[PDB]
Amino acid sequence: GAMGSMERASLIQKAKLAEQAERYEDMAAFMKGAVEKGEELSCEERNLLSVAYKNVVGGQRAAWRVLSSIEQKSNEEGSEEKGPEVREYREKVETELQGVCDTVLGLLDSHLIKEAGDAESRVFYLKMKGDYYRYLAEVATGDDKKRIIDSARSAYQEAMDISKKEMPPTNPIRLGLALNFSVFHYEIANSPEEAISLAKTTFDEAMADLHTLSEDSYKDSTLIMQLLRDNLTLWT
Amino acid sequence: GAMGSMERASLIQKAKLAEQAERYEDMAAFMKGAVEKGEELSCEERNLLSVAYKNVVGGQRAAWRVLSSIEQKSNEEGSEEKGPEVREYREKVETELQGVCDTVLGLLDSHLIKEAGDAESRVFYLKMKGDYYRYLAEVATGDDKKRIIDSARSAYQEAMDISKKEMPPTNPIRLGLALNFSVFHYEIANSPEEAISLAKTTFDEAMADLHTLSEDSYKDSTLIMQLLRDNLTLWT
Amino acid sequence: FPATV
Amino acid sequence: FPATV
Numbered sequence: 480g481a482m483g484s485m486e487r488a489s490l491i492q493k494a495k496l497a498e499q500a501e502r503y504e505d506m507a508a509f510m511k512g513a514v515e516k517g518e519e520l521s522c523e524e525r526n527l528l529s530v531a532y533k534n535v536v537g538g539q540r541a542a543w544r545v546l547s548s549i550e551q552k553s554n555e556e557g558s559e560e561k562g563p564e565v566r567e568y569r570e571k572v573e574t575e576l577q578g579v580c581d582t583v584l585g586l587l588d589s590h591l592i593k594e595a596g597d598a599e600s601r602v603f604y605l606k607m608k609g610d611y612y613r614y615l616a617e618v619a620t621g622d623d624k625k626r627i628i629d630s631a632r633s634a635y636q637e638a639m640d641i642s643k644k645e646m647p648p649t650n651p652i653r654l655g656l657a658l659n660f661s662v663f664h665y666e667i668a669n670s671p672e673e674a675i676s677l678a679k680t681t682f683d684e685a686m687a688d689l690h691t692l693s694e695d696s697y698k699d700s701t702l703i704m705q706l707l708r709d710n711l712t713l714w715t
Numbered sequence: 716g717a718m719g720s721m722e723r724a725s726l727i728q729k730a731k732l733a734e735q736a737e738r739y740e741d742m743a744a745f746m747k748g749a750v751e752k753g754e755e756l757s758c759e760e761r762n763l764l765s766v767a768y769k770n771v772v773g774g775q776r777a778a779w780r781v782l783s784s785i786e787q788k789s790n791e792e793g794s795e796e797k798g799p800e801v802r803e804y805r806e807k808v809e810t811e812l813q814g815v816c817d818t819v820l821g822l823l824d825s826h827l828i829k830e831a832g833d834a835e836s837r838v839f840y841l842k843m844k845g846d847y848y849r850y851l852a853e854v855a856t857g858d859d860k861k862r863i864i865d866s867a868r869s870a871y872q873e874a875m876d877i878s879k880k881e882m883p884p885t886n887p888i889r890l891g892l893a894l895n896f897s898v899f900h901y902e903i904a905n906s907p908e909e910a911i912s913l914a915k916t917t918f919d920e921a922m923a924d925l926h927t928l929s930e931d932s933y934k935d936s937t938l939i940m941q942l943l944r945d946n947l948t949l950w951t
Numbered sequence: 952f953p954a955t956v
Numbered sequence: 957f958p959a960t961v
């Protein structure tokens with residue numbers, strides 16, 4: 480590891496600086512270095528890790544979608560099949576995306592998840608595992624597409640089972656997990672009814688628990704609840 | 716699967732024909748199709764599968780070694796760094812090799828090993844799993860090299876434990892497993908002493924059991940025993 | 952595209 | 957190279 484000689488605390492501090500500078504590839508490399516020190520991560524640290532890689536892979540996904548759209552248009556009957564360049568460059572971006580996903584999944588498997596005993600850490604990491612298999616599923620076309628989809632589903636399902644036993648319905652990790660698992664159902668699993676049912680049940684159960692929250696927790700929970708409603712408005 | 720419409724028995728017959736024609740890529744595709752029918756494989760069928768892929772990957776390994784040797788020579792101080800072509804083409808062959816290994820490992824995991832209850836099938840498949848992780852290890856350089864090596868070791872070790880409980884010391888599967896695990900130790904694990912000890916103990920225990928064998932079984936066992944001796948002569 | 956977090 | 961089977 481290129482970060483192996485840097486102090487854990489220095490890596491975390493530089494991740495925070497990279498975030499302020501909108502240098503998310505650096506942020507992710509710093510947080511990968513911090514994870515590789517082998518100690519469990521605090522709440523703030525888990526969110527630094529997640530924010531870094533979600534921004535990196537988010538940029539790759541956006542680029543891949545542009546390139547895939549160009550590629551599909553270049554293959555419609557009535558175009559001008561220039562040559563291999565669009566496919567080649569889409570594949571390059573795709574391979575880089577798959578490499579980032581594999582890196583994150585490797586950090587979760589070695590060894591974040593197995594050491595995560597508290598619900599807030601374990602559910603957070605299993606949600607991430609579902610998310611990064613979902614990103615792999617978005618680009619998958621070959622013999623392992625069903626298996627990638629089921630790996631996402633299985634991770635999300637374990638996270639949901641823990642969250643329903645261990646967290647209140649307004650817990651923002653529980654809400655964000657359900658938001659993303661609902662998107663998995665709609666966009667990946669071709670299960671729009673399951674996606675709508677999950678988002679609606681999650682929203683209604685959170686609504687009925689809002690009265691227990693402080694003003695600050697209320698703001699956190701209702702933010703994700705609005706995203707659930709936004710998706711339901713898109714889908715219905 | 717491109718073979719999904721062909722009868723299992725027709726796939727096996729064509730694998731045998733491809734072997735006679737020295738068309739090992741076809742042989743492997745036919746046997747992959749046969750495995751994907753989902754039924755367990757007979758002894759003959761397991762050997763058809765193994766022979767096909769060992770010849771395919773064997774050709775790739777030989778090509779990769781030539782290209783890697785050229786690449787290393789082109790990087791020595793005092794050459795003529797033409798450009799990226801040798802590295803690019805070595806990487807192309809390497810990626811194709813890794814894809815074949817992943818295909819075989821996928822067949823073993825989905826679902827040959829889990830349905831293999833008899834020692835002769837289970838040890839055979841676990842030996843194959845060790846072999847194809849070993850081939851991946853031969854080209855591995857990055858963050859997963861140690862993990863690939865340990866996956867080979869673990870598969871070989873489980874196969875050895877079963878073989879020592881369930882098979883006589885002259886059983887050719889047991890012998891071939893030990894031959895290859897010994898090479899794993901020498902060439903992959905940097906454990907030449909373990910490689911020599913395993914080959915010598917395997918040879919001596921087989922020697923002492925030869926008296927129990929028919930003339931045909933004697934010929935089978937002593938053939939692999941000679942390979943053990945050949946390696947020991949190379950290493951000592 | 953749908954919202955995720 | 958060493959023999960394997």
Ligand SMILES: N=C(N)c1cc(-c2cccc(NC(=O)C3(Oc4ccc(Cl)cc4)CCC3)c2)cs1
Pocket residue numbers: 498522523524526527530603606651652654655656702703956
């Ligand atoms: N960037 C950073 N330096 C840090 C961010 C946080 C942090 C702290 C509390 C809450 C959150 N919450 C979020 O950011 C959002 O809510 C989420 C809810 C659930 C999940 Cl699972 C993920 C996100 C995304 C939109 C609001 C962040 C610590 S440090």
Ligand SMILES: N=C(N)c1cc(-c2cccc(NC(=O)C3(Oc4ccc(Cl)cc4)CCC3)c2)cs1
Pocket residue numbers: 734758759760762763766839842887888890891892938939961
């Ligand atoms: N080609 C084919 N149509 C088939 C070959 C076989 C078959 C039958 C009996 C023995 C063997 N034995 C081998 O071929 C060798 O011994 C091995 C011993 C152990 C292991 Cl694990 C693998 C090979 C490699 C050199 C001798 C093959 C059936 S069908």
